[PDB]
Amino acid sequence: AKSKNHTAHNQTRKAHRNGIKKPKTYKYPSLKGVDPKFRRNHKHALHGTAKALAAAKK
Amino acid sequence: SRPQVTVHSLTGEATANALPLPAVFSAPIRPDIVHTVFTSVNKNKRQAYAVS
Amino acid sequence: GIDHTSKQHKRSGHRTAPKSDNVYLKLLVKLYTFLARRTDAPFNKVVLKALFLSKINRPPVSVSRIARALKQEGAANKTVVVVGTVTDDARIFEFPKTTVAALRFTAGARAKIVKAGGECITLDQLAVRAPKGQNTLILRGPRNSREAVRHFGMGPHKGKAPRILSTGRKFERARGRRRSKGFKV
Amino acid sequence: PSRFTKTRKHRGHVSAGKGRIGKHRKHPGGRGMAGGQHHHRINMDKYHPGYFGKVGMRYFHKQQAHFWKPVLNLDKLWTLIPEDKRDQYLKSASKETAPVIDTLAAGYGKILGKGRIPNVPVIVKARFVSKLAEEKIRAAGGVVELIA
Amino acid sequence: AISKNLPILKNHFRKHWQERVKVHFDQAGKKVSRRNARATRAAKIAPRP
Amino acid sequence: QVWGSETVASSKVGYTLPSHIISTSDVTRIINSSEIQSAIRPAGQATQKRTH
RNA sequence: AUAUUGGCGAGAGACCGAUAGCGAACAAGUACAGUGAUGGAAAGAUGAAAAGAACUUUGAAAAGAGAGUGAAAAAGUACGUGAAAUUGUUGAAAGGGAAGGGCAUUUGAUCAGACA
RNA sequence: CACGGACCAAGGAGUCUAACGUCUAUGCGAGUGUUUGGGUGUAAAACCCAUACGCGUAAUGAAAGUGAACGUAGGUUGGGGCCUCGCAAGAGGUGCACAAUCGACCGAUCCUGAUGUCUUCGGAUGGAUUUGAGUAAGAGCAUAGCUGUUGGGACCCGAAAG
Numbered sequence: 001a002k003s004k005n006h007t008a009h010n011q012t013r014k015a016h017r018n019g020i021k022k023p024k025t026y027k028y029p030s031l032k033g034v035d036p037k038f039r040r041n042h043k044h045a046l047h048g049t050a051k052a053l054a055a056a057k058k
Numbered sequence: 059s060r061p062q063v064t065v066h067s068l069t070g071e072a073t074a075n076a077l078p079l080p081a082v083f084s085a086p087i088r089p090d091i092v093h094t095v096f097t098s099v100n101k102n103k104r105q106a107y108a109v110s
Numbered sequence: 111g112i113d114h115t116s117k118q119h120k121r122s123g124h125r126t127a128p129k130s131d132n133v134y135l136k137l138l139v140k141l142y143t144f145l146a147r148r149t150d151a152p153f154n155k156v157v158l159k160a161l162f163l164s165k166i167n168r169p170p171v172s173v174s175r176i177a178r179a180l181k182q183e184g185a186a187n188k189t190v191v192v193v194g195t196v197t198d199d200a201r202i203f204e205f206p207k208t209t210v211a212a213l214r215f216t217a218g219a220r221a222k223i224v225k226a227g228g229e230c231i232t233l234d235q236l237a238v239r240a241p242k243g244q245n246t247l248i249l250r251g252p253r254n255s256r257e258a259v260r261h262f263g264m265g266p267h268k269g270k271a272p273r274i275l276s277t278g279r280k281f282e283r284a285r286g287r288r289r290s291k292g293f294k295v
Numbered sequence: 296p297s298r299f300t301k302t303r304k305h306r307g308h309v310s311a312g313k314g315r316i317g318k319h320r321k322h323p324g325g326r327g328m329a330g331g332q333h334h335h336r337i338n339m340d341k342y343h344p345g346y347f348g349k350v351g352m353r354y355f356h357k358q359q360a361h362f363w364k365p366v367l368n369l370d371k372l373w374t375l376i377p378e379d380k381r382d383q384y385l386k387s388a389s390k391e392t393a394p395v396i397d398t399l400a401a402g403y404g405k406i407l408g409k410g411r412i413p414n415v416p417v418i419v420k421a422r423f424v425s426k427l428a429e430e431k432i433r434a435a436g437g438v439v440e441l442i443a
Numbered sequence: 444a445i446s447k448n449l450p451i452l453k454n455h456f457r458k459h460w461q462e463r464v465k466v467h468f469d470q471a472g473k474k475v476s477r478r479n480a481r482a483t484r485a486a487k488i489a490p491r492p
Numbered sequence: 493q494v495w496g497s498e499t500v501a502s503s504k505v506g507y508t509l510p511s512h513i514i515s516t517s518d519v520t521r522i523i524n525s526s527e528i529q530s531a532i533r534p535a536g537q538a539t540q541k542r543t544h
Numbered sequence: 545a546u547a548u549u550g551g552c553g554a555g556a557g558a559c560c561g562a563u564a565g566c567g568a569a570c571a572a573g574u575a576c577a578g579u580g581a582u583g584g585a586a587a588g589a590u591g592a593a594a595a596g597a598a599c600u601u602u603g604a605a606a607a608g609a610g611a612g613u614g615a616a617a618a619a620g621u622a623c624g625u626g627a628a629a630u631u632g633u634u635g636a637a638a639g640g641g642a643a644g645g646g647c648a649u650u651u652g653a654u655c656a657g658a659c660a
Numbered sequence: 661c662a663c664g665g666a667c668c669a670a671g672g673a674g675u676c677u678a679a680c681g682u683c684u685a686u687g688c689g690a691g692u693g694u695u696u697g698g699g700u701g702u703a704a705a706a707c708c709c710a711u712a713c714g715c716g717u718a719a720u721g722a723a724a725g726u727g728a729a730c731g732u733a734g735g736u737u738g739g740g741g742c743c744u745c746g747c748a749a750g751a752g753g754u755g756c757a758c759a760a761u762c763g764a765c766c767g768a769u770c771c772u773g774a775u776g777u778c779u780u781c782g783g784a785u786g787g788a789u790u791u792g793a794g795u796a797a798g799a800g801c802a803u804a805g806c807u808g809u810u811g812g813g814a815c816c817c818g819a820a821a822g
Contacts, residue, residue: 028761036789081497085509090131103705107559134514148532174797201370203413213513234514241531250757265341271793273450284348291348324444335445342448351722456811471704
């Protein structure tokens with residue numbers, strides 16, 4: 001009583017019903033995986049530049 | 059001022075007595091609410107029935 | 111036959127009109143289907159579709175959030191609009207004057223607003239005061255602060271807080287939630 | 296109301312919404328949570344992470360009395376005053392007269408610090424406090440009496 | 444039978460639980476039996492309250 | 493006294509009569525007014541000539 | 545104070561309405577089956593009232609046929625209404641190894657509406 | 661040339677409930693739930709109500725335990741709407757919800773370890789490619805309905821057995 005095991009038929013056709021949606025990619029991507037050493041400094045770069053205007057903006 | 063409903067005697071014959079509206083009579087009129095509350099409240103006097 | 115790039119006879123997925131049977135509700139839906147049509151200003155067209163929103167899509171706008179939007183620059187003279195219910199926030203110990211127009215106020219937020227020399231309005235009087243919407247702020251309450259949305263999209267590594275009856279030790283903290291027993295997530 | 300159910304729309308259709316191939320039968324996946332390690336595993340993982348196993352110490356004869364410690368943030372803590380008297384204290388806020396708020400009278404076990412009471416000196420009686428809770432109270436001009 | 448995303452529910456019906464079901468239909472019929480017996484005893488016991 | 497009013501309160505503990513979510517129940521009375529018929533644009537013919 | 549599918553006596557229902565409701569609306573744990581333990585049905589309805597057909601004739605009788613009773617025997621103790629399968633009689637049409645169906649119109653029978 | 665069905669009438673199959681998920685309507689709303697009970701009544705209805713209690717408003721660790729603002733409750737990109745200018749087109753001001761993203765805050769784990777002290781207690785401060793079902797101007801509670809699930813005879817009928 002063997003069965004029919006594998007087939008790819010209909011799978012590409014089911015795939016295009018809702019059809020291969022895109023990244024929906026964003027400005028400002030996630031910093032997951034970025035260099036921790038760069039990322040530490042980047043904290044304080046932004047941390048300082050926000051206060052940079054806090055001296056000008058008042 | 060309220061509309062001043064007028065008082066009627068038992069022979070007919072209304073009278074110099076005229077009363078304000080209680081302001082329960084100004085409340086919103088909600089036939090969907092009354093319908094939902096009735097349908098539930100009307101179920102509160104009932105008896106069980108079950109086959110043996 | 112025709113070869114369609116789309117699915118036929120497919121509705122737009124919107125509220126054309128409320129699902130409520132409320133009578134006084136439909137009198138505003140009747141009032142703003144008229145102004146949305148003939149008044150050419152988008153404010154009326156925004157307030158209309160906000161009368162069709164369900165309850166879960168109508169979170170309440172606390173009387174504190176109303177005070178932020180007034181601190182917002184230039185808006186201290188505007189008439190804030192809330193399609194929804196205004197609720198009380200006593201965590202603010204001062205409140206401005208201004209005006210509010212909403213469907214429903216809670217008894218607390220009615221006092222607080224009246225307490226400061228301000229005024230509570232309905233939507234119908236707003237339509238009469240500013241049909242176009244002159245000098246108004248619409249404000250929405252937070253939608254994703256619900257208890258159910260906290261559970262949406264549960265699955266590995268998504269941090270979505272499983273739906274569960276009882277919270278504490280011994281309920282689904284063990285295998286798969288920590289490295290020591292089995293794995294983590 | 297059974298006039299609204301969908302099996303009162305399924306009159307006349309053979310299989311009553313349960314499908315003609317898989318039919319509908321008694322218990323296909325076993326009773327209840329059966330097979331939770333075995334054929335339902337993919338379900339338990341994702342939507343019940345942590346189900347199996349043991350975490351920490353047992354506690355014999357536990358009583359939730361010992362553990363009763365309700366918490367009241369400095370967010371509120373002015374709600375405990377009568378709203379008629381309350382605005383008497385906000386205005387004309389000085390020492391030698393300060394509102395005594397017994398937080399145990401209102402059923403609270405600890406005063407936390409979540410944020411920003413006003414500048415009015417207030418006497419707050421509490422069983423427990425937090426390190427930030429008093430700093431904001433004591434800097435407001437009031438004090439915290441401990442009780443039991 | 445475990446499916447979808449649902450809280451696990453412990454419901455203890457695996458005994459024979461329909462023998463032991465107690466429905467209270469007399470909640471309002473025992474309230475007058477209880478207000479009687481208090482007015483019975485209010486009179487029996489003399490001005491003793 | 494039973495349902496209260498603005499002056500006298502309740503006699504029912506923790507209760508006050510409901511509020512209107514619209515001031516006036518006559519919708520066509522609002523739709524005329526002044527300020528609305530001032531902002532309203534001139535109407536069509538209420539049925540459209542079939543063209544073509 | 546609590547419990548109660550037994551007992552006695554009571555009041556009730558968005559309950560069932562004789563293939564339902566208790567197994568049992570009736571001479572129902574009855575008739576019947578089994579060595580026994582046990583098993584266990586079917587079965588409501590003339591009319592307001594028997595006023596339940598005197599009397600005549602054919603027939604050995606049952607009944608028939610008239611009269612008679614009744615608001616009605618198109619209610620005759622086979623009895624309220626009396627469906628369907630199925631059947632007898634009459635009338636109509638049809639028929640070359642099935643029958644029955646759809647579209648179309650002729651022919652036969654019928655039907656209003658309408659006009660005026 | 662697979663299975664059931666001679667025919668007719670009448671019965672005949674996704675129900676109730678306990679506990680919940682989503683969705684919708686309704687009342688109130690940082691609360692909400694009168695009905696275990698008491699008052700009362702035209703009497704199983706309706707009407708009125710004290711105390712608690714349940715969920716919610718605080719999370720986090722096995723636990724002992726501790727417990728949410730550096731700031732207009734922050735910054736940046738985008739955002740309906742409103743306001744200003746302009747004949748308009750459009751630009752500028754403000755920007756709710758919401759999506760992305762970097763910070764600050766509370767708890768747990770590892771690291772540092774202050775003025776101080778019953779000399780080993782205390783834990784200030786400062787961290788970290790760490791971790792949480794968290795904060796960051798509350799939204800839940802109750803009833804009703806659809807659909808779905810679990811336990812129950814469980815949509816109906818059916819075993820060999822014990």
